[PDB]
Design a protein around this ligand. Structure first.
Ligand SMILES: CC(=O)N[C@H]1[C@H]([C@H](O)[C@H](O)CO)O[C@](O)(C(=O)O)C[C@@H]1O
Ligand code: NA
Ligand code: NA
Length: 472
């Protein structure tokens, strides 16, 4: 059904990822190797790794589906992510590097106290358990109708093999597989779009024309304020705070800021990522618009009532030659596994620093830290894999991202804020996002904005009620 040459390409890719993992296992001697990489990561490799970490099977599948069913207005969030990178570099990254963090949330205790650090660390770890499971399950849903294998078998290939080379290679193995996987998914995106242009009569010219005449690029009717609809202004506010969370308060990205040996190489990490974000996501939106025009020209090739979420997988397996199809399936695996490996290692770095090291009376030996470092990757991987099986054979935590982001903004920008007012901001923001999510029809893009700003506002107002702020 799927073919032998297609599987041979896919398992050639899977073998390469395992090989990179074994290679970098040789230098895994301390937790500083496993989590910080010994400063041996060049900036450009960390930058590709940031890009591959954030871009999962979520973007690979649902962005073309989004452009297919609607328009391109969500691409604004891509360039808002680039727009905030100078602010990240000048205000946040100096603290992460000078504190020589393993976990980004060590900043929160240095600025406030262990309460804010534990809140953000537990929220991150719990959220990214789900992110791994959701990434695995989305890849299964997209590939199961076309690979002809049991869904648990697919979960083993996607998740378990990724756990193995992640546990094997440390952050360096994670980063260098991310480099390979980031180039692969990017090349896959360009290749997919090119081959749709050949199969559409009129080529890219007809795709652009048909999409524009259907008003499926940037409909001016979406330039309007709304409290319920994902209009252009709403998604701009939502993606702004979703990107600030991703690049200032999220360990899987912040950890990349400290694997480089210098500030100059860190700046190049952001530049490398910005170049990929400016170019590669365009192709995923273009793939969606191209698939729209294609199945408007060939409506018989579309099953009646077909779920649009799998319109890109449907095209890939039916309209692309031998070997190329498996290369594209490898790029899909690459998009999923580059995000899973980063989440697992980052969950382990947070547990190692914020939980294991911080909450133990005696100081764990370097031997003990390494054991827990490798252990948590297996445990976090097992539970998120079982959750993925649960999702196939048959939100609340996500609302904490706002408060996590507000804590960092409060500490970095509000000097009067202290440990007590930060905790007040946490509690107030949790009430605010739960009220907005469950007691209103507010658009989901407002959740992160309400969580972040409630910590900033309440953490600033109630600051006099508590002892002085630590200077840091
Ligand atoms: C603005 C935006 O769309 N952000 C999305 C990013 C970017 O698409 C990717 O980082 C390329 O910049 O990918 C995700 O993290 C993902 O696929 O898991 C989801 C997230 O919603
Ligand atoms: Na990825
Ligand atoms: Na990764």
């Amino acid at each position: 059904d799927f073919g032998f040459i297609n599987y041979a390409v896919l398992f050639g890719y899977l073998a390469a990822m395992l090989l990179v993992g074994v290679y970098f296992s040789k230098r895994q001697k301390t937790a500083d190797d496993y989590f910080r990489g010994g400063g041996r990561v060049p900036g450009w490799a960390a930058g590709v790794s940031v890009f591959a970490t954030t871009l999962s099977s979520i973007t690979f599948m649902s962005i073309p589906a989004k452009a297919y069913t609607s328009d391109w207005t969500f691409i604004i969030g891509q360039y808002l992510a680039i727009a905030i990178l100078p602010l990240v570099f000048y205000f946040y990254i100096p603290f992460f590097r000078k504190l020589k963090i393993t976990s980004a949330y060590e900043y929160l205790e240095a600025r406030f106290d262990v309460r804010s650090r534990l809140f953000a660390s537990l929220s991150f770890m719990l959220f990214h358990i789900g992110r791994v499971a959701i990434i695995t399950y989305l890849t299964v849903l997209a590939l199961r109708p076309f690979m002809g294998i049991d869904p648990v078998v697919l979960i083993v290939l996607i998740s378990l093999l990724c756990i193995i080379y992640t546990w094997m290679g440390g952050i360096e193995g994670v980063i260098w597989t991310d480099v390979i996987q980031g180039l692969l998914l990017s090349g896959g995106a360009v290749l997919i779009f090119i081959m749709i242009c050949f199969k559409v009569d009129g080529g890219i010219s007809e795709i652009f024309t048909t999409t524009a005449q259907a008003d499926k690029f940037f409909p001016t009717t979406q330039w309007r304020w709304s409290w319920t609809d994902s209009t252009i202004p709403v998604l701009m506010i939502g993606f702004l705070f979703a990107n600030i969370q991703q690049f200032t308060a999220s360990q899987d990205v912040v950890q990349r800021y400290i694997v480089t040996d210098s500030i100059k190489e860190t700046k190049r990490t952001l530049i490398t990522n910005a170049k990929l974000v400016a170019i590669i996501p365009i192709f995923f939106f273009a793939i969606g618009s191209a698939l729209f025009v294609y199945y408007q020209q060939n409506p018989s090739l579309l099953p009646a009532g077909f779920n649009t979420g799998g319109i890109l997988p449907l095209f890939i397996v039916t309209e692309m030659p031998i070997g190329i199809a498996g290369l594209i399936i490898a790029a899909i695996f690459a998009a999923a596994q580059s995000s899973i490996s980063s989440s697992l290692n980052s969950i382990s770095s947070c547990f190692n620093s914020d939980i294991y090291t911080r909450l133990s009376k005696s100081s764990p030996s370097p031997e003990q830290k390494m054991k827990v470092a490798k252990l948590v990757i297996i445990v976090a991987g097992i539970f998120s894999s079982l959750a993925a099986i649960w999702l196939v054979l048959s939100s609340l935590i996500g609302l904490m991202g706002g408060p996590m982001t507000g804590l960092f903004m409060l500490g970095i920008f509000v000097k009067r804020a202290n440990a007590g007012s930060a905790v007040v901001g946490i509690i107030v923001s949790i009430i605010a996002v739960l009220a907005a999510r469950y007691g209103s029809d507010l658009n989901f893009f407002f959740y992160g904005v309400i969580g972040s700003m409630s910590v900033v506002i309440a953490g600033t107002i109630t600051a006099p009620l508590f002892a002085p702020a630590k200077q840091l």
